[PDB]
Task: structure prediction
Amino acid sequence: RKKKVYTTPKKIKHKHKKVKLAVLSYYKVDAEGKVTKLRRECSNPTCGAGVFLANHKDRLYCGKCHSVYKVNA
Amino acid sequence: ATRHVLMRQGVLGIKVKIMRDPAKSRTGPKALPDAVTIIEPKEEEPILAPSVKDY
RNA sequence: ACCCACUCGGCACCUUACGAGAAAUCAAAGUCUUUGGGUUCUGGGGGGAGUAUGGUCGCAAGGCUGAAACUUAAAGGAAUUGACGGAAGGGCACCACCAGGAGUGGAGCCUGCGGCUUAAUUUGACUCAACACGGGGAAACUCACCAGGUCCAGACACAAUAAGGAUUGACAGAUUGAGAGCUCUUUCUUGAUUUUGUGGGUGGUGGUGCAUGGCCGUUCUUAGUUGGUGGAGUGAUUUGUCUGCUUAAUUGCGAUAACGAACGAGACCUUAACCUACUAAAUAGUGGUGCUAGCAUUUGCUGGUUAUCCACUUCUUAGAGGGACUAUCGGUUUCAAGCCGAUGGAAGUUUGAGGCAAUAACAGGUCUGUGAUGCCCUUAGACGUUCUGGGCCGCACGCGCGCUACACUGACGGAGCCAGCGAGUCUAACCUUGGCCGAGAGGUCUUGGUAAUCUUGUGAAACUCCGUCGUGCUGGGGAUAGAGCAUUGUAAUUAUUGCUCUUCAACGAGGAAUUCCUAGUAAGCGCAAGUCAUCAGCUUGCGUUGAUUACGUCCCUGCCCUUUGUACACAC
Result:
């Protein structure tokens, strides 16, 4: 009970948790106008039509549908 | 009955054996197998002559 | 010369304790803490050491006289209880022998050890009392080992961060064995459930079995063990608890400073034997037949049928019992306990076999059974847990338990007919009849059975009847290998297992040594249950066929009791 080498590199590299940035959900700034939309939500009715869904590149990933959501765009 | 008690230094085993009274058995044998009890006979008055009991 | 009674003086002896003594013992070792009859010599813990030195005697060997330095906590006496003895006397044991049987040790293989090897080949146990044992027949898990990867399941309470956000989880890319966001440029997401430091927990098949409980093995299958009150001794302690005889037995008969008891033995409790005696029973078996089969109708023999009848428990089952207590005779014995014969009896080696089983112990095994545990260690890239792979199976070699054999008291093929123990499917599929397919192993359909009703008369095997083989490692043996089929499993490759064909090795009865066993016992034979998804060459039982040789002994190995000796007591 004194043998430990750990030939692999130090693997304590726990994942990031969306480090504290500015206020999220950047809808728009409209002078006495309807707040227009950016990174618009997808077409699935399961979303509350106000949740800023992810869109990396020609694909959409849904946080609420954490396991099953894949569309070709 | 065996029991384990936990002290600061370890565990102590307690073993309690009770031999109860067979004359209290209320079930199964009422005495030990080797216990033989003799019934005392009742002495009777002699005769000294043949008599006939009258109806 | 003897025999009596004295007497004086000797060598002694027996008994007892007035006494004495540490006791052994002592008529002196008494008349000595109630200390004094006279007198000589000697000793002052153990060694060094009867040495050195001086003296003196002697031819010499040596004798007499005779230290110290230094060293040391005990040496020593007498007894007690044990243990031990190549001590004695009794009594015993096939874990001893005797006379034998079957064997093991020799071969191949299967398993467990050691060593070697390795990333790991996890580990405990090493004479009896470790090595087919941890119910340990490990493919994954088991698993504790090794190569790696996750996850926290770090409770609960103190400060920081902290809804202008504690911090959760992610498809797809890179990375990875890997559809593990494990992690990482990339964005989304639930929200106080957590994250970070702190105290403190938790888990641990991590250590200690020499810190423990319990349990188990062993001492030790033998018969032994202990109070009370009396007796003995200053005492430890002893007597009781024993000279003798008997029993398997501190079993009894008895003897007797012991009497009266307790545990162990026995008794006891299960199991196997007997019941034509009671209760019985379409979940077991019995008889004329209702019905229907064959040779056969003389007036029989051999079968099938639950709802077609009645009666029975001989046999089967179980409950209540009875039976055997050595019963009755003969012989023997302080003419007792008992033992030995013979006749009955199912049973006459406490009827056979078990279960249970003193005191006191062992630093025996086990912390890897336990959420049974004290202390120590680790505790978040943890020794937790889980996932994927391996290892526990590796092979120069040594050892133990075993399986198969070396053969015609046989091998092979065909034919016959036989048991007993036991198990079986519920939030999941067990034992599986029968029909059909297949050479075989196996595959398909449902009624059968949660069970004396169905597997299952478990139609087992050894075994008997005919054949083939013919003393040739041969048709003995079937190790080692090649090809294929199937089954179990998510997964079989360093072959799970079975089957078909082929391959056809040592082994020609085994050295020193050594094991078990006295009647349905050994041995042979197979069957069922255990662990079992699959795997028995292993165990726990069961039944089938069923020898030799003993009815003893203490020679070897031990055991119990007594006596004895001991410089032993961590006890030869």
About this structure: The longest strand of chain A covers residues 59-61.
